[PDB]
Design a protein around this ligand. Structure first.
Ligand SMILES: Cc1cccc2scc(Cn3c(SCCCC(=O)O)nc4ccccc43)c12
Length: 220
């Protein structure tokens, strides 16, 4: 998160931290969010050969008794996700086990408006800056699909366009999989943007995927 502020500790009890392990040399992290005791929602590009979800965290280096750390037993990336258009950048992860719903671990209930949104993550706070230990949140303005014109592969039906170009505030590298919340409702998922950090950034439109989602949760 660029140009945000530290969340109050444990205000986002649905925020997952993910440690992805790649078949090559492992090591990257994404955000996510708990939507069912044993289901976490995140961006498709965060797939790896193994993933460990840390729920309940705020400073992710400091261990504390709100934490619950779980392995992922099944990776459910969208069948139509395409690595060179980044369409359908959405993945559900099945946890080994049902997380305990506590104050600090809970699910996410499955004139500008209305289109005032927040996003949080532990990702980079500048273009080549380190990530954040403490979970960071930023307030972003949702936008017209014309603002994301330069992103050759944007589709207004599949994706949202987030952030004021005139401002520095944005989700960034390592924020992927994070949920965008507009007036209380989860509307988007951090996907990508320009590597120079200049807003707007593209997020996956959750609304387009509620049918495929509830499909995964009906089996499984
Ligand atoms: C999330 C974000 C916001 C604004 C600009 C940019 S530029 C790259 C990213 C996120 N991202 C990254 S950054 C490092 C990997 C972890 C992450 O995905 O954030 N690698 C990607 C591969 C495919 C699609 C997206 C990827 C990103």
């Amino acid at each position: 998160i660029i140009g945000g502020t530290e969340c109050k500790p444990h205000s986002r009890p649905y925020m997952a931290y993910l440690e992805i392990v790649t078949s090559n040399g492992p090591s990257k992290f994404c955000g996510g969010f708990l939507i069912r005791r044993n289901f976490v929602l995140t961006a498709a590009h965060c797939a790896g050969r193994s993933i460990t979800v840390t729920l309940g965290a705020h400073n992710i280096t400091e261990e504390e008794d709100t934490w619950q750390k779980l392995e992922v037993i099944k990776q459910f990336r969208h069948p139509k996700y395409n690595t060179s258009t980044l369409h359908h950048d959405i993945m559900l992860l099945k946890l080994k086990e049902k997380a305990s719903l506590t104050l600090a671990v809970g699910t996410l209930p499955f004139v500008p408006p209305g289109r005032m949104c927040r996003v949080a993550g532990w990702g980079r706070t500048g273009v080549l800056k380190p990530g954040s230990d403490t979970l960071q949140e930023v307030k972003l303005r949702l936008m017209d699909p014309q603002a994301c014109s330069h992103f050759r592969d944007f589709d207004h039906n599949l994706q949202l366009c987030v952030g004021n170009p005139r401002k520095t505030k944005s989700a960034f590298k390592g924020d992927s999989g994070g949920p965008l919340l507009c007036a209380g409702v989860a509307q988007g998922i951090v996907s990508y943007g320009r590597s120079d950090a200049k807003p707007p950034a593209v997020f996956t439109r959750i609304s387009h995927y509620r049918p495929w989602i509830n499909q995964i949760l009906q089996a499984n």
